[PDB]
Write a protein that binds this ligand. Structure first.
Ligand SMILES: [Ca+2]
Ligand SMILES: [Ca+2]
Lengths: 78, 78
């Protein structure tokens, strides 16, 4: 589904940050924080791969990795 | 915390829609769908109460109601 290297890179760098964002109990602030983490990661990869031939596939993978990370932490806390 | 009438109005109108959005298994589409429901509700209330004296309080209540609805359904499915 997703590129395993892309998954390792994003999980490695950003999972702890996304976890902290999800762990904020005040739900508005948590939503804002989670979105901020996602937006940063998306922008980092967009900048890095803007002209790459597999750009569209990469960006779909980044979006899926981020959503799976969020889902895993929401599940894990519940 | 939130105005009980505002809560009843938004839950009554939009909970089933937010539930369907959260229930979509494909996580990107679910995220897009949930955000679309939230954006509509926020815009409806912003338009209705743009000049009201309690606008800021109302809009914070709308944001909290929407986040609580999302949390309740994510919890309920898990
Ligand atoms: Ca999500
Ligand atoms: Ca939320």
């Amino acid at each position: 589904q997703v590129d395993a290297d892309l998954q390792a890179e994003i999980v490695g760098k950003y999972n702890a940050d996304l976890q902290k964002a999800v762990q904020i109990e005040e739900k508005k602030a948590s939503e804002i924080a989670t979105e901020a983490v996602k937006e940063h990661v998306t922008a980092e990869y967009e900048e890095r791969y803007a002209e790459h031939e597999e750009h569209d596939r990469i960006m779909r993978d980044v979006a899926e990795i981020l959503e799976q990370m969020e889902h895993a932490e929401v599940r894990r806390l519940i």
